[PDB]
Write a protein that binds this ligand. Structure first.
Ligand SMILES: C=C1[C@@H](O)[C@@H]2O[C@]3(CC[C@H](/C=C/[C@@H](C)[C@@H]4CC(C)=C[C@@]5(O[C@H](C[C@@](C)(O)C(=O)O)CC[C@H]5O)O4)O3)CC[C@H]2O[C@@H]1[C@@H](O)C[C@H](C)[C@H]1O[C@@]2(CCCCO2)CC[C@H]1C
Length: 187
């Protein structure tokens, strides 16, 4: 492979940071951080409660498949921030990466869209996005305008997938609002 841009690495540090914080701000995360994070997620997103019995598997698959490239790592393995960034670099080159993001996103979307409409209102999306990202200033990023480019007042599942795929893969566009799909960037 080539090398990721500095901007893309910053985006990946932005993915990793909340997990690092969950694990005690040690600079690394473990399988246990994600297992413990199940309860935290059920409290923050009670929309996930109807599928709470699937959460431990989701955490474990996240550790093995997303964080560690499908490899079973030793008990106690400590994945560092910089390592996650390089593992994510390999991951986004996988032929099935886009599908993996969509499948994961479907698990969240089905909790917030119980009637299976395929969309939510822009105001609902704004409140939910603030909850997801913990960025109280998410609206000012422009992301809701950039997703709803025709001003329908709706945000579709596909809108959010498009923003997220840009975030996980784009190298050089540093100003587009889709940069902020996970909230304000860390250093
Ligand atoms: C939430 C998320 C992202 O974080 C999540 O990121 C991914 C990348 C890494 C992350 C994995 C996290 C694991 C550790 C956890 C562990 C457990 C047990 C469950 C699970 O839980 C995740 C949600 C949550 C809360 O628990 C979290 O940890 O993230 C979803 C996948 C599940 O397997 O994975 O999964 C891909 C799927 C994606 O799915 C949604 C994403 O589609 C949300 C979407 C982008 C949002 O768009 C909007 C508009 C744009 C601005 C932002 O707001 C409105 C609201 C919402 C639709």
């Amino acid at each position: 492979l080539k090398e990721p841009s500095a901007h893309w690495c910053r985006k990946m540090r932005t993915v990793f940071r909340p997990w690092d914080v969950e694990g005690g701000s040690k600079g690394y995360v473990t399988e246990e951080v994600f297992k413990d994070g199940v309860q935290r997620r059920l409290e923050k997103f009670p929309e996930l409660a109807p599928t709470k019995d699937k959460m431990y598997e989701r955490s474990h698959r996240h550790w093995v498949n997303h964080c560690n490239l499908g490899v079973k790592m030793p008990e106690g393995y400590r994945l560092t921030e910089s390592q996650y960034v390089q593992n994510a670099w390999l991951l986004i080159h996988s032929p099935d990466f886009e599908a993996s993001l969509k499948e994961s996103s479907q698990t969240f979307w089905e909790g917030i869209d119980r009637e299976k409409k395929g969309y939510i209102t822009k105001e609902e999306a704004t409140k939910l996005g603030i909850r997801v990202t913990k960025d109280p200033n998410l609206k000012s990023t422009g992301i809701f305008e950039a997703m709803d480019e025709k001003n329908t007042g709706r945000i579709t599942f596909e809108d959010t997938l498009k923003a997220q795929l840009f975030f996980f893969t784009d190298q050089d566009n540093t100003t587009h609002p889709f940069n902020y799909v996970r909230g304000a960037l860390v250093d």
